Design a protein around this nucleic acid. Sequence first.
RNA 1: AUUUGGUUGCGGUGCUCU
DNA 2: AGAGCACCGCAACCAAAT
Lengths: 273, 471
Amino acid sequence: PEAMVTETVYSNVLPITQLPHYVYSGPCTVPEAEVKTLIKWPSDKRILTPYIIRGGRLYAFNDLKDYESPFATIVDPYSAQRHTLNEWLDKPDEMRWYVELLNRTVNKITGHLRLKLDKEHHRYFFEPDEPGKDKSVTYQSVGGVRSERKVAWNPHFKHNDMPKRYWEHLAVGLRFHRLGDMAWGFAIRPERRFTKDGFESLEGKATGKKSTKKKSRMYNFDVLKEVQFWRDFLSQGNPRITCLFGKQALVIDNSLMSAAITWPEISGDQANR
Amino acid sequence: MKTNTATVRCELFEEPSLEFASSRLHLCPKRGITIFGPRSLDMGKRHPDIVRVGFIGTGETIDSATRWLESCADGVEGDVANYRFPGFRADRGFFSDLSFDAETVERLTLRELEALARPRTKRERFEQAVALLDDKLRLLSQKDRPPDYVVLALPTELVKAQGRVDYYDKQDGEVHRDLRRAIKASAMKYRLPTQILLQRTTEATPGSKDVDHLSKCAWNFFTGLYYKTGGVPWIPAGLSNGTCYVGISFHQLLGSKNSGYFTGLAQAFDEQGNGLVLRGQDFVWDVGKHGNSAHMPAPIAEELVSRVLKRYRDELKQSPRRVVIHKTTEFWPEERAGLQSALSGVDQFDLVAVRPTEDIRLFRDARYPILRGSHISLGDMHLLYTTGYISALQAFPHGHVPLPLKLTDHLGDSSISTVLRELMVLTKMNWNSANFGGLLPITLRFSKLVGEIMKEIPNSVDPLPQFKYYM
RNA sequence: AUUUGGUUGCGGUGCUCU
DNA sequence: AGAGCACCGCAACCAAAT
Ligand SMILES: [Mn+2]
């Protein structure tokens, strides 16, 4: 309490600066275990095609109203209603379909990055390309500096010995949040997933020990670096996590939501901004 | 669609002070007992001058716990990261004396520890374990001078086999029973505040892991020993004069086939100049009430707060000025009408719903975490740091990064900053430990402790409203 | 169970659809 | 008998905290 110092704090959420604002309904749909003849993969591969089948519809973003649609020229020929986000914002049930379409959207975004989904804990974890070998990914930061982190490493034992026979895959806990009437957030949670020799998960009890032994000495400087590494991996340069659908865009501005707080200072830290 | 970006606005809350001896304010609970002393030291004859301690250990554990309490109550040195223990004698520290009478010592003989191997399944074996642990609490409670305090120095082989028993019971499904929740409930019908003291603490060597340094093992044990034998270690300063803090928390029924969620109450109010008193759950909920969802319905909402005001107009003899209902879950509109129609006899109320969050967590570019007391608002989301780096001690006495306490819901006559100012001073009232602060307030921590023990009460036993029996 | 913080795993509930 | 989101309880192991 001897002096007040202003610091800048960094959250782990990313703002959503642009949202899809037209949900084109598909009210004639062959059920889920047939949908493979969407065909129509666009000349612009930047167009992504999420879809769900709820109540005999084909709720999607791919502009299914006109004739030449990227999604389902056979399943949904022209029948659509063009439901908006603005009329759906007051309905709790229809703001669940939208965020579930966004969850499938970021699942389809993390398909070129080759992050495999566990589909049970909502966990996007790395895996090595070739079995028995380590995966270390090279990434480009926002400021232009290029770095490289191991993400699927098998730790050799410290006393010049055989490896420790658990692979420490590095994982992320992405989730969508509503931060206002129309303000949104994209939350990044760093995590670890531990496998036997790769491609085969550990049990329920050994994972609890091996994640607590690792994430207890990971204090508030080696969690911020993982959050920064995850926004740089989801970025791959061009500092806007973008997604196109055809006249619609989901653009995530990849700057962590900062602030400024005045508090009595901490001796020995002296944060260099 | 250009979405409007959320505004991250922030403020920090000043750390509250606690009233120690001679009404002297200090921040840390550890340092305010060394300099001044416990709060009840001059408050009257409520200070325990002589504490009589009994044991229900075996032969070896009683001797180990006795030499631990004689090499631990006379001052334990600490390093720079652990503040030292002054002592538990009549001239050091808490200014109270421990006295080991040899008449109030029960003993788990070896003919009885092997009698709980004869039953076949895991149900009757655990039931006989709770049976003799209840019987030797009974034999201490029926003496002409019962002890002020009972230390169950349980052997390792009993705790390893019957400490946590899970089985299948036909119509109930997978049932998980705990020894600690089954002997703090059997010690409550005999009115004996107890303390389980395993061999991992009394036999712990210096420079060994999985236990604290002996300074913190002294502090967290003897603060609880000082509160459980009567008297109060510390009371806060910045609190109101008529608030009736309620701490409602929901709990599953005992069994994997019984679907339902009952409640747990915790009154935390102020009685004259004695400071905070912690009452809760004089009754047991009827088996036909339940509640299918996680929340609670409207007749339960009208009965519960009626019994809250009945407890307030029996010890303070006034209607409460404010009723602040902290709760773990959100407020549904079924239970929002019923905590408002039945609070018409109280001027102001504050239906508050907090819960620690999952993914959102603010970080800092330095090496130490963001402080305790921050109030980060991400638009409509409100995040309070009851855990973090503390500016009074200049240390982070935990691991990893602290979780935010998200304010999930609020409705009432108070602001958000006012009730989150009261929540941070209600955080510091965990008399179980001599720590600086925790995550949940004591209203939501005592009522996660009373409903876990209501799952191990045989119906006709009326539970007792003290913080001693549930600690 | 001296103690708190956090991690991991499992399950439950509300709502919508098949 | 499943799918999805949003939100809760509780049981095991860790580590003493830069
Ligand atoms: Mn205790």
